[PDB]
Amino acid sequence: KVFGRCELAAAMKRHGLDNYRGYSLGNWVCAAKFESNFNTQATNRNTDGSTDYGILQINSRWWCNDGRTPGSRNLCNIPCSALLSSDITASVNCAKKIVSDGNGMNAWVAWRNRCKGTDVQAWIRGCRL
Ligand SMILES: [Au+]
Ligand SMILES: [Au+]
Ligand SMILES: [Au+]
Ligand code: NA
């Protein structure tokens, strides 16, 4: 599923991300944009052999089991395949654990480089929420 901007903002808002650990909805939507281009099916291999999965590009090194990332954790207790659903529940619920980690949204390289300290509110303007 490739979500529209306001469509993802609404779905993220429902699943409890709006100002979750202090990050406004616009951060999460900006994060999704630059991580996955709003595509629930997005996969990208990292240089270390791990893979990032789904709309928020959750990494196999720590958070999910994909059965080809040796010596890695599954801190969200899920198959990485669950993160590629058109239903974002699992991605959202695993992102909540990630962002609570104590590094906050800095764990998303695209958020830090492209969203952090920008006008993230632009990512929800004109959306009904
Ligand atoms: Au959720
Ligand atoms: Au994020
Ligand atoms: Au959803
Ligand atoms: Na893993």
In order of 42, 46, 80, 116, 125, the CA distances from 61 in angstroms are 17, 9, 11, 23, 35
Where are the alpha helices (H) located in 15-123, listed in sequence order?
25-36, 89-100, 109-114
Cα dihedral across residues 101, 54, 68, 106: positive or negative: negative
Number of domains in the chain: 1
Q: Which residue type occupies 54?
A: G
87 assigned binding-site residue: no
CATH number, domain at 28?
A: 1.10.530.10
The resolution in angstroms reads 2.2
The residues that are catalytic are 35, 52
Domain with 88, as residue range(s), is 1-129
The Å distance, Cα 69 to ligand 2 centre, comes to: 22
* Ligand number nearest to the C-alpha of 88: 3
Q: Which two tokens stand for residue 69?
A: 């990332």
DSSP letter at 59 equals E
What whole-number distance in Å separates Cα of residue 62 and Cα of residue 82? 15
